[PDB]
Amino acid sequence: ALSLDQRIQTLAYEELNKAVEYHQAKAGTVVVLDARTGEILALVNTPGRNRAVTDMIEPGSVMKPFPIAKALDSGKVDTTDTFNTLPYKIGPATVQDTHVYPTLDVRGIMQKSSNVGTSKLSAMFTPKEMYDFYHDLGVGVRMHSGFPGESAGVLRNWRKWRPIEQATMSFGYGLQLSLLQLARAYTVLTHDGELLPVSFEKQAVAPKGKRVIKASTAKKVRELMVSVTEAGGSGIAGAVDGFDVGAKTGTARKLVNGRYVDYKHVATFIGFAPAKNPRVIVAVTIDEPTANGYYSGVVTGPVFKQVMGGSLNILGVSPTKPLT
Numbered sequence: 145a146l147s148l149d150q151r152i153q154t155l156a157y158e159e160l161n162k163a164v165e166y167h168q169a170k171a172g173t174v175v176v177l178d179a180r181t182g183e184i185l186a187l188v189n190t191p192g193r194n195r196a197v198t199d200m201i202e203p204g205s206v207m208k209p210f211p212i213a214k215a216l217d218s219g220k221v222d223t224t225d226t227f228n229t230l231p232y233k234i235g236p237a238t239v240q241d242t243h244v245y246p247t248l249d250v251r252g253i254m255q256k257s258s259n260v261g262t263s264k265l266s267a268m269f270t271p272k273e274m275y276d277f278y279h280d281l282g283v284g285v286r287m288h289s290g291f292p293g294e295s296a297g298v299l300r301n302w303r304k305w306r307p308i309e310q311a312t313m314s315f316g317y318g319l320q321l322s323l324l325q326l327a328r329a330y331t332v333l334t335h336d337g338e339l340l341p342v343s344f345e346k347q348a349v350a351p352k353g354k355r356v357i358k359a360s361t362a363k364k365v366r367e368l369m370v371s372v373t374e375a376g377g378s379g380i381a382g383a384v385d386g387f388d389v390g391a392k393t394g395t396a397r398k399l400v401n402g403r404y405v406d407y408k409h410v411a412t413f414i415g416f417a418p419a420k421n422p423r424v425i426v427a428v429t430i431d432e433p434t435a436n437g438y439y440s441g442v443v444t445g446p447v448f449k450q451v452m453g454g455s456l457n458i459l460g461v462s463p464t465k466p467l468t
Contacts, residue, residue: 147183147346152176155454156186160428163447164190167433170408171195174447175327176455179422182331182340182351184289185455187324193402198293200320201429205257205378205394205440206414207316209333212254213365214277215265217357223250223364229260234308239263239315255371257378257392259315266314267307274310275302280356281329282339283319289342297321316394326414327427333369333390334422337362366390370419381445382413384453386463390422391415391448393441398431408432413444417452418464426452 156174164172173196176186189195215221229248231240241258253261266274279285284299298320300309312318321329324342331340331353338353357365369390372379379393396410411430416422428444428451437443 145346147178147185147344148187149185149458151458152186152451152455153188155458156188156451159447159450160188160190163430163443166436167430167443168435169430169443170432172430173323173428174451175323175427176451177327177331177342177425179331179334179416179425180340181347182328182342183347184342184344185424186451187344194291194293196323197289197291198295198322198402199398200295200297200322200325200400201410201412202317202320202397202399203326203394204316204396204412206326206392206396206412207319208257208262208314208392209254209365209369210277210281210329211262211266211274211314212250212368213333213357213361214274215268216250216364217361218269220268221250221265223368225250227253227261227264229253229258231260234311237308239311251368251371254368255377257372257394262314263311266310271302271305271310274313275299277356278313278319280339280354281332282325283321283329287325287328287342289324290344295322295325297325317397320399323427323429327425330414330416330425330427332356333362333365334416334425335362366416366419366422369415373415378441379413379415379445381441382415382448382452384417384449384456385467386465387417387453387456388419388464389415389417389452390419393444395440396429409438411440411443413440413448415448415452417456418461420464423459423461424452424455426455
């Protein structure tokens, strides 16, 4: 009566182990969720504790879809609105992008995973509004998944923030989530704006979602996220032949390791497919890759690609375009 699919579990295990070996990494995790039920289809970690649930990270770029979603959901901005995306200062701190563009529209802000653009979208909202939104996504909240040692992550009280904290949170630093929490948050995008509960038991009753954004917003955001896995986006290494995939990739930071402090870079890739009508969310982390790549997409993209493609094949979902 587990919801896990042995074929997907085996696939995830094999692909994770391949990447951890190739990149000479310290650890890794893969989570596969049913995109419309929140059931866990696979959950694998390298040997030791259940890092998917026990270990929180500052997620980095994989958090960026959420402020964009909030901004669109509010009606304050449109996907065609253009922002100045030059580096800027908040007191002595600088917010800047990997690759600098003078302006981007909201589509471009998603496509390029712009720190500046994402932070300016967040900046249209008060600290309380942003906090309440992250809380509604489950940040800092117990999932009660049935696993012991389940991290709640960290969402600092907005009443204590600074303008720089709100900005960094929008691009995934200064809040913390486990990989399972991150996969769960993506159900807002896949399940037409409603956050699903997570479970490893086969469901008997349809889960009740909690509305966070409009279904129309979720649909638009999924469309925007496809650009991340096409030429010009950071997540091209995770593209899946025969499908459109909405995803994000980035370098996360791990500040806690079990019951001890840590400081490690973590390569991350999270996405869903088919993008228009998603069946699966696949989330991958690889801790401290030391070989054949540091850049997050190169390290975790291939795992995501193989696990997503394999999962869709296992579940019988037909490609939506011819294979290349």
